[PDB]
């Protein structure tokens, strides 16, 4: 059952790090989208 405990800890930290990673690219992508929208807005005001 020690191997089973190793497995369960394995998937819990694996899914936690996947959640952290995915929120990282989500937030950086939303920042990049905001930057592109601002660039378009300032280009329209030129």
């Amino acid at each position: 059952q020690s191997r089973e405990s190793l497995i369960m800890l394995l998937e819990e930290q694996l899914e936690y790090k996947r959640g952290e990673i995915r929120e990282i690219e989500q937030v950086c992508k939303q920042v990049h989208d905001k930057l592109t929208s601002i660039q378009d807005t300032l280009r329209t005001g030129s």
């Binding site: 660039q39 300032l42 280009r43 030129s46």
Partner: protein, 46 residues
């Protein structure tokens, strides 16, 4: 007439190169804004 002149400061101010200087400052700030916005557009597209 003199009374009406007296109470209003704006008319007495109304009553010539400064306008040209203001136009020059407006156009130079406009062109520097255009240049910096062009630089931002060029840089952000990567």
């Amino acid at each position: 007439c003199k009374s009406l002149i007296s109470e209003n400061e704006d008319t007495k101010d109304l009553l010539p190169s400064e306008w040209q200087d203001i136009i020059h400052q407006r156009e130079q700030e406009l062109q520097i804004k255009r240049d910096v916005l062009d630089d931002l557009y060029r840089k952000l597209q990567r």
